[PDB]
Amino acid sequence: SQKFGFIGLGIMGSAMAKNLVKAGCSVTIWNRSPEKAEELAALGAERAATPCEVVESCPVTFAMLADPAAAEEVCFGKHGVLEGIGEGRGYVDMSTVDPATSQRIGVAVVAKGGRFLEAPVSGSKKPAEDGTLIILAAGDRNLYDEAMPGFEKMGKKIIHLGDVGKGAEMKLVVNMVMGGMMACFCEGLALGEKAGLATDAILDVIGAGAMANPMFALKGGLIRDRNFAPAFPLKHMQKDLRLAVALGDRVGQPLVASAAANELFKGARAAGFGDEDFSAIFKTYER
Amino acid sequence: SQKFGFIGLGIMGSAMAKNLVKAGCSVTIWNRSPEKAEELAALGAERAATPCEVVESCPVTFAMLADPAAAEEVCFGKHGVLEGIGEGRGYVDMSTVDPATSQRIGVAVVAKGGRFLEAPVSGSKKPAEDGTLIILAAGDRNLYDEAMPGFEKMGKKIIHLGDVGKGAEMKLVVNMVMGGMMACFCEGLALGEKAGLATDAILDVIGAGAMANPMFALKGGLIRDRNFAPAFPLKHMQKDLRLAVALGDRVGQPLVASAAANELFKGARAAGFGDEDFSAIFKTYE
Amino acid sequence: SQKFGFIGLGIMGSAMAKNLVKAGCSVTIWNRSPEKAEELAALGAERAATPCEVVESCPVTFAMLADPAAAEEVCFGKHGVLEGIGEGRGYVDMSTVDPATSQRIGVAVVAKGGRFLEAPVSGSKKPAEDGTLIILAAGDRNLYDEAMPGFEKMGKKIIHLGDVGKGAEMKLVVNMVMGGMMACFCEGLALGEKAGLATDAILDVIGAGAMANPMFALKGGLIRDRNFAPAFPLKHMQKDLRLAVALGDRVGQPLVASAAANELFKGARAAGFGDEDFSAIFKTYER
Amino acid sequence: SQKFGFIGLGIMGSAMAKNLVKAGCSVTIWNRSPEKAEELAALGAERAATPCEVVESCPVTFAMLADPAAAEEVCFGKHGVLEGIGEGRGYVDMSTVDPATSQRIGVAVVAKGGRFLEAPVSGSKKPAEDGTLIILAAGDRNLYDEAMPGFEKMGKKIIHLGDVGKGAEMKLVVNMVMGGMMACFCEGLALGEKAGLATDAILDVIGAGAMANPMFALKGGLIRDRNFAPAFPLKHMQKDLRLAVALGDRVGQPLVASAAANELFKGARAAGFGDEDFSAIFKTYER
């Protein structure tokens, strides 16, 4: 009987909101495109007209938006979060964004009388459905504690990393490694294909060794079957590497391999695989 | 007892031969630098003076050498394997090498009337010691069978990938992926550090998600502790990336990311870390 | 006598402003660090306390600032350009900046009653002293024409590329090539030296052939002299490549080589060479 | 009057040999594909059956072959140079090859009692036709002096760089820079196009500044015209980059930018552009 607001109902946000509804929470919902909202309304969610409406009437609102532009627009725009937020009500942006953007939103939220937490996550569509996300929160400690029962229905591992920005930083670091791994993994599979190796043979050897991981296992088979249905949209992976490179720029860390990965994913977007899974980068190598 | 030869007693070869001796094989050994052969001798292994002498004396001889140049010198060089091979005696080269190299060696061995099998391995120093290596054999099926009692004491998973060259291609492909992973893992750890995150915090997050793997777990802890004692020598990792990139060149596959990792490992070599663990590339981002 | 304002007196701006004074113009100037104004001051230039003061009192003001942040500060900041412009007085920003910020600045200036023109330049310290800069202007065509007497004393080739943003786009494209050229040039020299080749011999062979250019001729000589006094500060070259990569991201162009150059220049900054000439990247390839 | 052998009648060799024939030399020629000898044959050149036959009968023989594999097959193979050289007759290999290959050949040649000089060249099809090549010789000085009358009909600048290997190293260093700069140049034109800049405007701004060079000027025009008729075959550019990166590996020089260019040229080969001009790499940058 806890009440939560939820803003942004894409791949990740849709499954997360549904987990709050399945858990018995009363959930108030908003999405720029109505159709996705109409999906959860049918499940028992309450549908709000604007972001303003959601945070105007919910003690704690989660948001799961595409990128900094989306997060900023929803926050600062007409009928946005800033218009409805206040009197201690909390805004929890779980979108992957740059530390400067979450910090910017946090300040504005706090100036309106609200509280702000950032909580980017690790784990894709399936972990979102299963409620097994890893939640990387940073910011208001009281809001962290208050949002916890919500977090616990969305994730398995929930941590607090300190001041606003540290969560974004953790997320960007972790995803940079993932993007890099995926680029290299695909180069291996493509090279193997051209060398005359069977994919399953390669997958079998990797699976038996020190590099074995769930991501290689999952994506390996999907690549073999040439199924690139989006779990983590390729255009979002590229956005994340974009942000990781800007973080590197700011803190003075050269990132030769991760910058290469950024460019390769840009190639995949240009090729038209932007709305496909990020594993679709394999098709640029092949092709 | 079963008689085996063993050529090349570095980190890997030393640990492998010791398993053969431990299992009660009668092992004849050779290394370029004789000090490395002293430890095995003390365990009962018989020292030969040249590779030619090991291969003269043994029905099956394994080799675990640094690189293509090493493999070729031991094979084609004065008093090398070729001078001693014959009468169907078998040479099983387990060095990590390019396909052209192992094929060239096998052709020459077969021409001398010997049998040839390539068998590079996956798994590092600890797996070598424990005998839990993954063995990626390719070549003569009958020599594969004959070496099997040895393979079983050196490894836990043994497979045969087809014609000579297939073992080398598989090995290069998987190590290329590993080298890239290490490079990216390290960029992440150094970026996180400069952003002000705790190394243990990053490690924990990674260990909890879809990327988690034994390599990151072990190497992450050693990076945190600044311990870079060689398990897989950085110079050999770089060599493997070199070979992978050459293979890409031969089969018409661009490898932008893996080529970048190759150059970053070359940077680590130039900084003086070639004899440390390949995880020492981390220090170049530092 | 013709009167111009000038904002930002670094390596470029001070040289360009000197040319206007030498041409006989009455010049009003300003720099964040007032000490740098002292030389032009002795030359007859009148010193202003604020950018606001400069644009208050001049028909046309040129600016030559480090980067988008600096250009944004001077424009929108306290006592900035915005507080001063109006009644048709022109602002010509010659800073190297991304298309979006020059547009954002233009709209702001124009909404204040002022006129805006961007005009980034190509050519370093010596061309700036010699008045042989290439001027890549875009924006208010009328301001362009009134600015000409000034352009013609600062540069040799002056062109108009269309709407605000086109100048910046041309400038970033050209500098991206330059940065990538410098990185490849230095890799060659360092490789040559490590192979035991005399680097003067290398420079002679390049100079004799199809890729010979003034940049290689000069910078090669300086590298040989071990003279890295800044003509184009390395930190600014890195900034330009950063902006070029962002442009790539935006227009959907993967930039594998250029992105690599960006990272290599970041390494040069991490190594402490940011305030040396961009050719100092050579020292990262070495010793 | 002079008698010369010539081996390898590809794009460069046929043009070089014609210059010796036009100069009144008596020239004995050989090519793996004998039809490439037909034009020279009608010009009075004498057909040899095998490389060994050329080197049996000529005091000095030049070779202009594709790559290290070709150079070695011609030297060490059946009916090869080694079968025919001796009694001080000279072999001048002008192929672009790695130092260890040319040294290998030279040692085997000297063992047969012949003399050896490597002399790779800088300058493409047009300079080969005009006799305007830069010749980078290394090795036997007496042979250098003996071949000079031939070098003088084939090139304009002729230098001697020391022992065998120095010429190869110089050639590889210089070509590495040229390959990276082509890659960067093309990234810039492609980026500019996608930003809505006209390519002629970009060309004109570059040609006015410090980067201007004959290569950009020539290739820029042909890119604009989408004319990629081979002057320097793209597969050979890629082979040179391959060899330069291996040189880097051997002498302890990381080559981040140059290795990137190597991979991009590989991409162009994979798209089927291997036999077009190396400027065809541009076509991989724009679908």
Ligand SMILES: NC(=O)c1ccc[n+]([C@@H]2O[C@H](COP(=O)([O-])OP(=O)(O)OC[C@H]3O[C@@H](n4cnc5c(N)ncnc54)[C@H](OP(=O)(O)O)[C@@H]3O)[C@@H](O)[C@H]2O)c1
């Ligand atoms: N997918 C994953 O595996 C995964 C994992 C961890 C983190 N993330 C992060 O989660 C966030 C969302 O990812 P996703 O995979 O769910 O993305 P998605 O399926 O593409 O959905 C993106 C969401 O953002 C909304 N949006 C975009 N621009 C907007 C704007 N201008 N105004 C209002 N809403 C806007 C979209 O609304 P519409 O429906 O109207 O288009 C949609 O709800 C991203 O930051 C992503 O990086 C994703």
Ligand SMILES: NC(=O)c1ccc[n+]([C@@H]2O[C@H](COP(=O)([O-])OP(=O)(O)OC[C@H]3O[C@@H](n4cnc5c(N)ncnc54)[C@H](OP(=O)(O)O)[C@@H]3O)[C@@H](O)[C@H]2O)c1
């Ligand atoms: N270490 C690992 O985790 C790992 C894992 C899988 C595969 N491998 C592969 O296993 C092989 C051996 O690696 P390692 O880790 O054991 O390396 P190592 O400790 O460096 O030993 C390499 C061996 O090669 C020998 N060698 C080098 N050059 C030679 C030459 N010219 N002539 C004769 N012998 C020569 C060395 O002889 P000296 O003792 O006289 O110097 C030594 O016995 C390599 O191909 C490596 O890539 C390594």
Ligand SMILES: NC(=O)c1ccc[n+]([C@@H]2O[C@H](COP(=O)([O-])OP(=O)(O)OC[C@H]3O[C@@H](n4cnc5c(N)ncnc54)[C@H](OP(=O)(O)O)[C@@H]3O)[C@@H](O)[C@H]2O)c1
């Ligand atoms: N140098 C070249 O060869 C070259 C060639 C073409 C174009 N450019 C471009 O021209 C522009 C100027 O470069 P430069 O070489 O002259 O650089 P510079 O010597 O380093 O100085 C740049 C100027 O920007 C000012 N500045 C930096 N941050 C500021 C801030 N926050 N608020 C107000 N002013 C600020 C500096 O003021 P202070 O004196 O107080 O530090 C200085 O006046 C840059 O965009 C550069 O990329 C340079």
Ligand SMILES: NC(=O)c1ccc[n+]([C@@H]2O[C@H](COP(=O)([O-])OP(=O)(O)OC[C@H]3O[C@@H](n4cnc5c(N)ncnc54)[C@H](OP(=O)(O)O)[C@@H]3O)[C@@H](O)[C@H]2O)c1
């Ligand atoms: N083109 C340029 O702008 C330029 C400039 C400077 C240097 N170079 C270098 O000059 C050399 C010649 O190249 P090119 O431009 O003239 O290329 P090309 O037209 O492709 O000629 C290659 C030559 O090599 C021969 N060849 C290849 N493999 C052979 C083999 N296995 N056995 C015997 N002959 C073999 C070819 O014989 P077939 O006719 O039978 O195929 C042909 O004569 C190359 O090293 C190239 O890198 C080129």
